[PDB]
Design a protein around this ligand. Structure first.
Ligand SMILES: *[C@@H]1O[C@H](CO)[C@@H](O[C@@H]2O[C@H](CO)[C@@H](O[C@@H]3O[C@H](CO[C@H]4O[C@H](CO)[C@@H](O)[C@H](O)[C@@H]4O)[C@@H](O)[C@H](O[C@H]4O[C@H](CO)[C@@H](O)[C@H](O)[C@@H]4O)[C@@H]3O)[C@H](O)[C@H]2NC(C)=O)[C@H](O)[C@H]1NC(C)=O
Ligand SMILES: *[C@@H]1O[C@H](CO)[C@@H](O[C@@H]2O[C@H](CO)[C@@H](O[C@@H]3O[C@H](CO[C@H]4O[C@H](CO)[C@@H](O)[C@H](O)[C@@H]4O)[C@@H](O)[C@H](O)[C@@H]3O)[C@H](O)[C@H]2NC(C)=O)[C@H](O)[C@H]1NC(C)=O
Ligand SMILES: *[C@@H]1O[C@H](CO)[C@@H](O)[C@H](O)[C@H]1NC(C)=O
Lengths: 536, 541
């Protein structure tokens, strides 16, 4: 079909090379590649782009970010960006993200916690509206007023505004928020992940599975489930289901997950694999279980969740509920850092987590294997401030790629700005023999190993200010030299890059203050020259 | 539908109320509107987006920005963003910019000074390539390697690479660079503005006009033409012309402007108006003429330029040639800040200039005549660093709008980032009576006066953390208030709506100065509102 990717393949999560004989790792360190960002920046000073939501299906992908105006305030939340696009081939091994349709919402009504679900050549956006024109001092739970938007690759834009009565709730909620993590569409049913407080308790038996707590009790568990904030109402998680084959306004149903399996109802992401027929469930830890809440969710009655222990990363938060905290405590704090599953049962994962323990700073890309971190790479710097992070991986031209959008603070004129990063995960599983024990394969074929292209290590001549200069271009740095000696003899680049590269790779920390000349009359001196129009 | 904007028309012509009885100004203060930026940001921490080029024709607009990689270095210049799009109507008075086709160049060859020119349903891009695999210590003319890219609204892409011999040069150049300011397409001919050093001097006296200089000499004028940095080669300006509808590779011709009219050859912008049939020419001042170099180019078989004196803004520069030197000195420095003409003969102009004297900081939007500044507004802060600025104005639904893309520094992860700003210029011409003596008109009708919509002055109830509270949203600030029952209806439980308390609360909120609303209890009717700052527990800010 048109307006759809082709070389895009879901990860073969059967890539579980377990057993002590085989060890999984990365062959080539991931490198951030430059491409036109599908997340357009803000143009009004003060208005910040935040809360990114990215979903990838087997046909198209969808993206959404909220533009909080009036100095990055959560009270002017009516301006959003909703886009549907597709990955594409541009004649190279680099997947090129393409935006085909975009729906820039600019109405006045405040829509918060806008999540996205990429479907079959279409996308659904779930937001909620808490603003109300009337007020009653008596107890009067306002309609959740959630809006479901519908954007197709053909430019079609539709939307429905629901009330509390139209939606089928199994239990009465006090407030309903969409999890900023992406929804998922399977078959004819779109499922979104929601979280909210219930008016009355249900099981009163919290998750109460302490990861590494020495002293804990059940009362602490069920007390943390109903924090002091939100009015001591149990924060539970639920699934919103509505069918795409419905005429006009879709019918909505809500199935609330039992509080015994969900530790704390908060934001989270739903991912589904056609290769596995499994819906992996990520749940952001906004309470005490700072260790990542990954699990495998089972559709259809009876709905079942299998939580998986992750002890390689964590989410920063305020004391006493920051990283390294393992005991149940009444607290609401944390950050959204999802973990994309790279195994059939979350055996291996790829994520962009905040390395700090308390302050939400230092974004770091990392591949984990539940026990440790297989590999790691800092996004920018250690002092970099960050916010929500989302990560989604795919396969393009028999190579595993990943796109990770992270909120970064500050910005050029705003407080936050979600920026995407495309990188290659050269997954390699090798034995004790030091050799690759197995080559990961898929339906399209065996995944290729190595870099998509050889590193650029060239040397050329460049004219600046009517003067020619030798240029050594290496992946670690580019240095210009000035030719300073001789119509009797002419020359070209010939083979001077490699002899210069050999000495330039060793004296790289010294920035090569000397230059080994040639036997001929030619010679060059290392000087830094710049254009006259931009001194910078 | 079609792939062009509707209800968009050019300005000028009617803006001729230059009579001393009538003064021209702005009615409503310009406000930056939020829209999805058609300048996509960078995704690599090392590569920085820079050198924006924006062109707007009578059908579509074109944009281009260069991604300098390897730590924002001007040596890794192979990535470029080329886009063609259109304005559109979304049921509002706001001009919504729409990007139709985008061509992300990612070759390895270094292309510097990439200029764009919009026209009909397509756009042309002119870049140069100074990289050469060959080299000669003796003086040899390098291949021009001019690359002309071609992008249509249907996604069609084409490109040509030229040679020093294929192009028709009236004089032998040593180096040729495209002016970052946008080109223009008239009829079937695409005109770009180029600048460069000549191998041999034409030996013509410079512009040699004195912007209020007590002492200047003829030789001082000729010194700036041939600076020491470029090897005493006269920096001249020329026009590259190539015709569309040509077979295969289009033929390129170069017409060098005489050094008598052009003071110093550097970057510049060409803008042509269908209503006026004139090509207004901006020239970036990179020498001593710190005053903005605006002029009116005519396409006559004899090339002719008439420069218009502007004494309202200037460009920051080094100590010998700053924004206040204005007298002939041998120097090469400055910044690109073009001025979009709002008059038939550059009578009024709109720009975003750097208000500082030396450092390229403090970007400031300003509308000027030929002597002073009509109105001014800083973009963000005074300490904001900036770079190149480009500005293009138009009409949408009988309203004067302007888009200004300026380089801002620093960025989120790069050194530079071009960001656009959309604002409305409420041009009003009136006399001392104080009543509007002139209503600006156009082909579609009289340009409407006033703000595009009434300012948002709303009040509403919002529930956060299961707690309802008042929210007063005004254009100056948004304040939440805790609702409390001041014995209303002789019962604690009550029902109140927005329209019953919003208008007087808005009146009281506008009177209270900043830092007073978040501490002042607002009591009205039978309800007490207490300014309390509360946010959701998900994200603390
Ligand atoms: C999750 O992923 C992490 C990634 O670090 C794994 O943690 C490491 O696991 C390894 C075992 O797989 C631990 O032991 C290390 O083994 C190396 C040798 O491994 C085999 O391979 C070589 C050939 O490739 C053979 O020569 C050798 O006999 C082994 O059969 C050693 O190299 C490591 O330590 C030494 O390395 C060099 C010398 O090569 C020395 O200079 C170093 O100083 C060092 O002494 C090491 O012994 C390793 O310790 C684990 N690291 C951590 C941080 O825990 C997890 O196992 C994995 N979890 C899973 C899969 O469940
Ligand atoms: C080129 O642009 C300049 C800026 O637009 C023009 O300057 C303006 O010229 C008019 C001519 O009438 C002056 O109008 C008079 O101004 C005074 C004062 O008005 C207010 O402004 C001053 C600012 O210093 C302030 O001190 C006062 O308190 C007032 O608030 C009135 O008394 C008169 O009635 C009359 O309107 C403008 O003042 C003047 N503006 C500035 C900033 O100098 C200039 O005329 C243009 N040139 C041409 C040839 O058109
Ligand atoms: C302003 O007032 C005068 C009073 O004589 C009047 O004649 C004129 O028409 C009015 N309007 C103008 C000058 O635009």
């Amino acid at each position: 079909t048109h307006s759809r990717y082709f070389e895009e393949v879901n990860l073969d999560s059967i890539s579980e090379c377990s057993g002590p004989d085989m060890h999984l790792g990365l062959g080539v360190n991931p490198e951030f590649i430059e491409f036109p960002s599908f997340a357009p920046g803000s143009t009004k000073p003060g208005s910040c782009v935040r809360l990114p939501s990215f979903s990838l299906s087997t046909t198209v992908f969808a993206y959404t970010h909220t533009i909080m105006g009036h100095g990055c305030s959560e009270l002017d939340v009516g301006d959003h960006y909703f886009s549907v696009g597709r990955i594409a081939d541009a004649g190279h091994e680099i997947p090129q993200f393409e935006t085909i349709s975009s729906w820039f919402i600019n109405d006045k009504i405040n829509r918060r916690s806008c999540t996205v679900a990429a479907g079959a050549m279409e996308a659904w956006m779930g937001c909620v509206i808490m603003t109300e024109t009337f007020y009653d001092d008596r107890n009067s739970l306002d309609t959740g007023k959630l809006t479901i938007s519908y954007l197709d690759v053909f430019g079609r834009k539709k939307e429905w505004i629901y009330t509390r009565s139209e939606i089928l709730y199994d239990y009465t909620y006090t407030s309903v928020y969409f999890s900023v993590g992406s929804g998922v569409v399977v078959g004819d049913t779109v499922y979104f992940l929601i979280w909210g407080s219930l008016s009355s308790p249900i099981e009163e038996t919290a998750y109460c599975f302490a990861p590494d707590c020495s002293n804990y009790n059940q009362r602490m568990c069920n007390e943390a489930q109903r924090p002091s904030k939100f009015g001591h109402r149990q924060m539970v998680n639920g699934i919103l289901k509505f069918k795409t084959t419905s005429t006009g306004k879709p019918l909505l149903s809500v199935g609330t997950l039992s509080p015994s399996v969900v530790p704390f109802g908060s934001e989270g992401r739903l991912m589904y694999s056609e290769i596995t027929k499994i819906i992996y469930l990520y749940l952001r830890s906004t309470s005490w279980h700072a260790l990542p809440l990954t699990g495998l969710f089972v559709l259809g009655p009876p709905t079942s969740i299998s939580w998986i222990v992750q002890r390689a990363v964590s989410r920063p938060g305020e004391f006493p509920c920051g990283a390294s905290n393992r005991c149940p405590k009444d607290c609401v704090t944390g950050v959204y850092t999802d973990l994309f599953p790279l195994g059939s049962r979350y055996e291996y994962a790829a994520t962009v987590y905040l390395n700090s323990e308390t302050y939400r700073v230092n974004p770091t890309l990392a591949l984990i294997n539940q026990t440790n971190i297989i590999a790691s790479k800092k996004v920018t710097t250690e002092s970099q401030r960050a916010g929500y992070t989302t990560t989604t991986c795919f396969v393009f031209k028999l190579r595993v790629w990943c796109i990770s959008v992270v909120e970064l603070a500050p910005s050029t004129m705003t407080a936050y700005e979600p920026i995407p990063f495309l990188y290659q995960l050269d997954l390699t599983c090798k034995g004790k023999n030091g050799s690759l024990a197995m080559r990961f394969a898929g339906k399209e074929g065996t995944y290729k190993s190595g870099r998509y292209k050889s590193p650029r290590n060239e040397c050329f001549f460049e004219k600046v200010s009517n003067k020619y200069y030798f240029i050594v271009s290496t992946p670690e740095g580019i240095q210009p030299y000035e030719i300073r000696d001789l119509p009797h003899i002419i020359m070209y680049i010939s083979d001077v890059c490699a002899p210069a590269l050999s000495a330039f790779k060793k004296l790289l920390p010294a920035m090569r203050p000397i230059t080994t000349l040639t036997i001929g009359n030619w010679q060059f001196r290392p000087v830094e020259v710049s254009g006259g129009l931009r001194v910078n």
